[model samples]
Target chain A: IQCILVLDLSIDNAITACSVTPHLPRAARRVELHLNDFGAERAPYGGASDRRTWRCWMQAVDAMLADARAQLGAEVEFTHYYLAGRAALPVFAYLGLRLGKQANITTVNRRDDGCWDVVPCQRPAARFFDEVRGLDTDERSSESGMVAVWVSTQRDVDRGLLRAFARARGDRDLAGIVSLRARPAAGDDTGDMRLLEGADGPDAARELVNCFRSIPNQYPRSSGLMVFVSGPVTLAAMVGRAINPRIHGPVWWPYFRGGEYEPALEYPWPLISGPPRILIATANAPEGENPTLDVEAELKHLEEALAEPRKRKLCEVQRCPAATVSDITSALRSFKPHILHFIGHGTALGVYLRSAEHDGAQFVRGEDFQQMIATSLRQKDREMHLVVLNACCTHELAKALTEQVSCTIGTDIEVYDSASIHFAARFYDHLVHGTSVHYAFNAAVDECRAHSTSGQEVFCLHPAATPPVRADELVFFSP
Target chain B: IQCILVLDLSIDNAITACSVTPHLPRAARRVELHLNDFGAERAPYGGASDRRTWRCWMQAVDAMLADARAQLGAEVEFTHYYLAGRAALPVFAYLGLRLGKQANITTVNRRDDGCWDVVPCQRPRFFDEVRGLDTDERSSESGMVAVWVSTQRDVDRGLLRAFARARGDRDLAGIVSLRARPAAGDDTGDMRLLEGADGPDAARELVNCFRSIPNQYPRSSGLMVFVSGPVTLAAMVGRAINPRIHGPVWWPYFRGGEYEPALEYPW
Candidate 1:
């Protein structure tokens, strides 16, 4: 079994909270811990060191984890633990320390745009260790008891400040400073700091843990180690999880605050071991939801529209009734329709589809519907020349779909059923007769105008803008 | 005819020098002024008022402008002028003051990710004037002579410290701030800062803000512009400074510690 743990401890409200749902596996159990209430006052900065509130927050996290474990059950072994959150460095470290390295953990980093991106959890190659370097040979002397380790991939850390911080800590004698800097790519001065020099997240995490674990091996007599991390919080937590009291001496984790470094938390500080209070909120994998439409009349009209073209046999038309999402996917894969006509019910938000499991209406938002269509078409190496959304208030859907499809036709306002049937039939008639998509769309609009006055102002045409397609020249079934 | 004017007066090397080419019109004449040689020292800060080297830099700018004007010709009524650069705010204001408001100018802002964006240059609707706020009514009625334009995000008032510090310990004048209202579904709060679906008319709204500055501070001899937005908007704000009509405008540059008025137009 696989599990998803979403901890929302960001200084601000997790605006991208919904982003996690799309990345879940079909059978993965989801658990969310909303610690956003404590984040309001001390936000835009951290409150980890504030002794007054730290215990309560830590206790809350402890209870939440316990509850999650109980809900998942101790007997079921989870193959993957997907962790995602936005919190202070110390909070992240604490969470990692609690979770430990026994589990196969996959972490996600929160982007600047409030989106969560999965940190690749693949193993690292031998060449990955080349970026780690040890600096200051003089500090390797026997007199030095403490060593400072600086791990940064984003920007250069102030060495002067780091040294000053060490001196202020009264560690006059140092074992030496170990630097894990991200080397710039060949010929590029500004090296890409993405995912720690492009290494997978798990690879980087393990490498960092190994780096910490091997420090004692390097300096056999060194008493303690000081760690300063300047990178993603995911890496920090992974490194924190590796802090074993038995293998190493006391470890100090200092966070950067107010132009100087201040100690936020130290390892082995009264471990809170128990099942966390898990607030279980599970969202099922996205399935298709389609609404019932004028199946018989629309099919007859389409059959009649294509009847004249059957003599020429230039195009093949397939009619799908009460189509579920999977039906659309399968049809796209097998039939590969050039022009897809979705004769269904739609609103400003999205279109309604027949539910895959039941005979209920399924609502798919414009964004989701576009994603579904684009991904399915892309995977099958197929192209949709034109899409006709013959439904009410589908202008927004048409606009969104135009990004992938060459051209799309939708209604600006609520459309009448008879008017929709007339438009689709006339549009297909013109298309099959070798008229450009632009011409066919206009002809259909004219047909609607002549038949019903109310539907005249409804239909709108949208064309792809990025590549600047000439819709006026797009002739369907020319052969 | 459209023309592109690119000036590189950045403290560090202009990493985004190539960004100007994409925004150029096919028929547009391109002119580049590379003043990066003088930017090595006292960089990451402004050198506009540095007495030892200020005149030489100013003279270089004067020569470049003169050369560009000569190339374009005296009688070629230019339909559009496209300006782009990465320099101290004062340098930009000086270029704008010299060019004046005679030409229909379109400005390009440099982004944080090392790119340039075109500031829209269309006439504003009446509703465009609504977002402009005359902050501190007491100052608005009296000694307010500055306009703060923040199209990307709100500018921190702490930046005004450097503005007052540069102007002989004088307090900042009552200022009018211009911001674009966030559109529907814009959760980032900065989506309208760029040219996209959410902000198709963002450029026009910003252009209107620049145009409204003079009227907001009519009685003052000059205006100080604090631009907390795109670099394109800053250059356009500089172009808005019509030295002949409006008084000389002061452009402040932020050094590491405090802000300092780098240059005043109408020199």
Candidate 2:
């Protein structure tokens, strides 16, 4: 029989911890709050200190299980665990990456005045097959004889794009094309895609969401979908939010650029052409608090992920040591990489970098980072694809980066170093193989969820939609 | 023999909903995220629309139970329920107040990184009047001081009166209060108004508050402390009470509109 164990991560406040223990519902077999010391350090943590911390965590879990058994009778075995609270996220993510293979591990979201809402994630299992499902569908030829739906709510479909798609289709038969254009609303007719496109306000989501409802499944299952989308970034995201990733699947795009019909895909774009120039900026935590992460190991992990001959060619790499506020700009100017991967710690309002003065860690405000990136992008006009802030409370930072970068990915809470490394490796590995960023994102998330022994959903995506920068087209390496 | 029904309150994100359903462990008999429409408006709900929202919530819960029975056999009966997310708080609080008699129900801890840590509260159980638990053990009726710890954490004037009445025969000293100091921590703290003072911190201040007593023409027959705040404060005060010289400590619960000898310092 299954029993629920509610782990309270908010135990630092002794009074609250004392109050919570007695108030926990009897249905909860046991509830324990063991503050993790490993979260203190910045680096390679698997030594004696790390093991001691893990042992302490295990002892607390074991103590809870024993207490539950003693209370519920010897036959009781707690096969289920539900974690709530903000600090629980990283712990859960790490648990998902590690023990998820053995148990059905997942995070539970508990609001200030509410019940448990399970934070959802996909399993990495079907992604490899799903990719092949799209690539080989209908035929091995380029076009795949698929019925590609072109939805441009603002204007007529570009003639050049149609020619590019047609020309790109070598020998393969082009299936019938369905185009849906939004009829301009009275008085709201304007060239501005932002005002015209998105599902704005409350009823907008319900009203504009119906636009995707008209997609007819007239084509055979194996025919696949080539979704050419247009309009505001919001509209693009709303579109991405609606369509199911399954059902033979989609290889969507925003616009075509090159002779090979190089389509600019949305966030997590599937460009799959060349190696991505990756500049990794790593930040170290305060000295003595926790062990420092092995930056070399992280780089090695990235190198191994891209070690496959094809992937190696696709992932052009550079490194920026423990970044500071100024270092962000300096490193960007030096590396000029397409993707800025910052592996560091972030607070509720800002990111933490190396400090030389005394504390060993410096705080970089999210707005300051945003302003710097904006200026950097303005001066160079570089189309940096992704800003992965692998740290705690980075959702807002990720949101801020959406204004400058094509798409930004960050953790809503603290993420384990292992999970962060694992996510990056998996994400890049998938990107190197010409898999869509859409698939790569889900696949990495699945790995995190599947292996999360702590059951926290650590990674969160902020798919910021910019003009011509839709989320669906944000491939790590574009053609 | 117990079962839990987890109700998800955050329906803003769509993809998360589908992923949560299949992975719910077998221990949970039911999990549902039926979008309650009332959350659309601002606060001060409980109108006709709010009532309709509650009605809809009930129907959804009923539907989940039906589905669970169809899936898990007729014997599966949910004995408890827990809620999560900020949107789910009020609905469950109201439900807990109304139906907690029928089933064990409550909300769990909300977050970790946040500063304000709310201690759990208990509804009034019972109150009674009795005599000389440790007062007789001390055998001193020289003076009795009223130790009032107030955060307005909860009110029980009946509890105040019971402690007051207990010292009817002894020479009564005025109240030594630990009032609401809101800045440093929760609504409950030391009378000094320092913010962030937790249970132990407040309790330490309380110990100092007691020390000033003996010098004020002091003979403590027995301390009759009246607490009207959080359970942790009550526990902390119990722990902080000097056991060596102090013969007995008194705690009273509010019941039947009057407080009486309902507790001894369990600590």
Candidate 3:
């Protein structure tokens, strides 16, 4: 099992309270996207006419979701946060609609009054893993099993969504048993298109689908199945502000090669058993926009669009306010937290804090975090069990992280927009499922990504989607 | 034109007194790899199996190359370096064979001072880039023609290479216009392959023939016209890598991407 933790550490994205809550140690699971920013300040993303753009976004989201559901060799859990507000709904609606869940989604601009209630999935065991052995045409037929078809798309395309759905259904067989139709649907040899209307819900998602309802169709029962959400009742929560984060592991992560994963290289994390300790925060919805070619304007745009960046909204500062190395150790002298996770815009430079003009503070650099941790723990020789940075390009600060924590996993660059949240959720899921920290991080980022729409493989090497070290060595549980 | 610059960057791989050459800019066009690794530390790349491996290796190497070579666009000339004593043959040998430049090859290790000379191609004025106004399959074919095989492996099926080597009884239009096999001084595809045997010369290439000496087999002529190199030499030296290097478009040099590219996007 590989565990991963994602954070909306733009320090300002609407995501509040991001933590892994994994049963596994923290160091082992560290596939992070640091310094990410999704703001209204940037250009809005829309659908493209070409298949390539759609394919890129789909692949990224699929990787994140698939990683969450799959039982990678290592058990891990991923958790992520979203700005708690209404503005984030556009992206949520975009994600829900594309994922076929647009039909049953219920959206809410739940106030972050400190009660950590998340917009939940109603379906039982709604997350699933697919295991496929080969193409349907293969004769030796040794190939058979469930193959996850993590998908997301705004427009209608039967060929794509149907095939992915078929693969998911056939996870039990070579071909899926088509769901029963109102009038006994045929074999679909003709491959016809079926449209269903979106179920109206209170939030933006249902409304968006209905708004576009006149223009197109919804998926047919044969194309998609209604999945029930299982409830252990994992409430997606956040640590409004955190400190004394000690990460473990090296920078490289498990990625796809020659159509499969190259065996994971070793790295360590700091966790034991998780869940209640670690929660899976899958991105039920993709970021509803494309990264503009211009990065600066893009950063500015997301800031305007998201409301979680509001300051007085969060704890004044993790209580002790340890923004430097000595500050971290002094504050953690009596403090011991099981796991640490953040979800927001991240970069290799570290978490992108909210700006001065906005309710948010300034951007935090890796150098600042490392200095604080090194000074705090290096002398006493105490290592925090787990640490997760949920920003883009945070992993690029490998040396600083490895020096202070057991394992520090992070991304080297900007991750694709769609899979950002789900990738974090899947990473946490593995950790909570009783895998070691390293395995959990590896499994979450590497295995969970298959469920992402934009294919996790493409994003792995992007300088951001890499884990810091191994999880097993760091985590040892006691009853 | 869709131009590409395939470079072999080995510090040991250098043109002697190249700094003193008449065209300093053209002579020193190199795609630097292992920029962080000291050039002296890197051993010559030791392996290459198929064209795809080279392509992937090219992808990585090109990223670095693109980093350094952006300065020489159209102003630069790509050179292949062969270290005098390395376990593997020079990258050029593999590159030439891939490009079908089997016209000349050398196998034995070079003396301490062996040099790789640059042979320029005759500016083909090559049929002038075929321009298109209206869509005609035959005429619509632009300077850059592409064939989309369903898969990458399809290019390796051995069928594609056949197009470069097929032939008939008379010279039906191929690089080599040969007559019926003469009893003496007979049939010369033998000599072409034999000449191409070294399989690693960065010079005029031989198409339609495989010449590994004792491994030679029956080869036909005139099935298809596959190109061989210095095929792009005229363009590379004349326009692609050189024209942009020293100009205002140092953007490619500053970052890997820019308005000007040393190697034109493969159309």
Which lDDT value does model 1 have at B246?
55
TM-score versus the correct structure, for each prediction:
0.33, 0.28, 0.21
lDDT of 1 at A252: 71
- C-alpha lDDT (0 to 100) for residue A440 of candidate 3: 58
The model with the greatest lDDT is 1
Model 3 CA deviation exceeding 4 Å by range? A1-334, A354-358, A378-381, A414-416, A453-455, A458-470, A476-479, B1-267
lDDT per residue, candidate 2, A398-451, as tens digits?
877886776778887644556566787798888776566677888888888777
Candidate 3: residue A414 lDDT (0-100)? 47
Candidate lDDT (C-alpha), each: 0.60, 0.47, 0.29
Q: Tens digits of per-residue lDDT for model 1 on B90-195?
A: 6666766676655666777666565556654443221222322321111233333566665555444456644554455354444455555456587756534455
The DockQ of each candidate is: 0.01, 0.00, 0.02
Worst 10 residues of 3 chain A by lDDT: A235-244
Per residue, candidate 3 scores C-alpha lDDT tens digits across B1-267 of: 112232433346532332223322342334323322312222333334344443454354445445434544664343332111221222332232222231121221223243333333211111111111111111211121111111001112133323212311211111111111112354433122211222222222222112211012112211221221221222211121111211111100001211111212221
i-RMS, each model, one decimal: 21.3, 45.6, 18.2
> First chain TM-score in every candidate?
0.48, 0.42, 0.30
Chain B TM-score of candidate number 2? 0.39
